[PDB]
């Protein structure tokens, strides 16, 4: 049983929150290209 988790630096956590607040993504793990 193995699981992938995504590791966020402080910079990346803050950036991801901004992306959610700007309605650019649904959640902070909504990775895309």
């Amino acid at each position: 049983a193995a699981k992938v988790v995504y590791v966020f630096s402080t910079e990346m956590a803050n950036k991801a929150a901004e992306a959610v607040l700007k309605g650019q993504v649904e959640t902070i793990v909504s990775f895309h290209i």
Partner: protein, 66 residues
């Protein structure tokens, strides 16, 4: 980490001061398993709220990330 019957009060990996029960704490889950005051890391309250809510997300210290 930090949920046992016999955990010490943990010092912040940045300021060395205790991370108390009425303070936001963030655990480095990259490797070190050090605790830190949210404030000391520079993470916003909103970012902390979102990251702590997401099961597939963890945080990594600036040391561990380099």
């Amino acid at each position: 980490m930090g949920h046992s019957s016999s955990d010490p009060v943990y010092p912040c990996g940045i300021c060395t001061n205790e991370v108390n029960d009425d303070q936001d704490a963030i655990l480095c889950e990259a490797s070190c398993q050090k605790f830190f005051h949210r404030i000391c890391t520079g993470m916003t309250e909103t970012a902390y709220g979102l990251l702590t809510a997401e099961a597939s997300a963890v945080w990594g210290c600036d040391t561990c990330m380099a």
